[PDB]
Every structure is written in C-alpha cells, then in structure tokens.
Design a protein around this ligand. Structure first.
Ligand SMILES: CCC(=O)N1CCOc2c(cc(-c3ccc(OC)c(OC)c3)cc2OC[C@@H]2CCCN(C)C2)C1
Length: 116
C-alpha cells in the first residue's frame, strides 16, 4: 500500500514510453529484443544476463505485469544499462542510448511525483 491498478499505471506511464519510441533514429535499436542469433554476437547473453527493450516494457504495461511504478523505471534503466555495458562508446547504439536516457529523465519525473 499504495495499491496501483494496472490501468492507472498504464495511463500514467505510457506517455513516458511513447516519448522514447518517438525518438528517431535513437529508439530504433531499442524497439525489439536484441537477437544475438541474427547479429552473430553469441557473447551478448554472457554479458547481458537480463535483456530488456521497449517492446518488452510496452508488453509488461499492456498485460499488467507491473505492480508499482519503480518496477517500470527499473526496466527502462535495465535497457539503458545493458546497452551501455555491451556497446562501445563510439557506437550508434551507445550514443542513441544516452539520448534516450536524457529524454526519459525529463518525462519520468513529473509522472513519478503524481503517482507517489
Ligand atoms: C540495444 C541494442 C544492442 O545493444 N544491440 C547489440 C549490438 O548490436 C547491435 C544492435 C543494434 C544496432 C542498431 C543500429 C542502428 C539501427 O537503426 C539506425 C538499428 O535498428 C534496428 C539497430 C546495431 C548493433 O551493432 C551493429 C554492429 C554489429 C557488429 C559490430 N559493430 C561494432 C556493431 C543490438
């Protein structure tokens, strides 16, 4: 307690996710799960033990898998930290991740205040 209904969390938090999706080209590496099979990077899951991406976060909101808002924030940051862990600092993915984190920080704060 506080108790959050899945519908309130979705209503309040989805705009913050949409803000990330709206970033182009910066969201593009983040819209679906990393496929180490396709990209030929079999070490990806050795390095990244808990993968996360926007599609997965959107599904969790959509299907009521978050009980409290910090679980959502933690997944967003997991996505960021996975990308900064794995990718070189000159890479598109890395630079795009840094942009997404700037955008997210701005959106998430007033939302998290309201939700309490
Ligand atoms: C969070 C994503 C991630 O950490 N990856 C794990 C790392 O692999 C990649 C990955 C994605 C991209 C990438 C880039 C640009 C895109 O649109 C503009 C895009 O759209 C789908 C994807 C690039 C990746 O790597 C591209 C090459 C792969 C071969 C080595 N080289 C250094 C980078 C996946």
């Amino acid at each position: 307690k506080k108790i959050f209904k899945p519908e309130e969390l979705r209503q309040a938090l989805m705009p913050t996710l949409e803000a990330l999706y709206r970033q182009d080209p910066e969201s593009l590496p983040f819209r679906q799960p990393v496929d180490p099979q396709l990209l030929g990077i079999p070490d990806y899951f050795d390095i990244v033990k808990n993968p996360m991406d926007l599609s997965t976060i959107k599904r969790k909101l959509d299907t009521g898998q978050y009980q409290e808002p910090w679980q959502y924030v933690d997944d967003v940051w997991l996505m960021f930290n996975n990308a900064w862990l794995y990718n070189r600092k000159t890479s598109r993915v890395y630079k795009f991740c840094s942009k997404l984190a700037e955008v997210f920080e701005q959106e998430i704060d007033p939302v998290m205040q309201s939700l309490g």
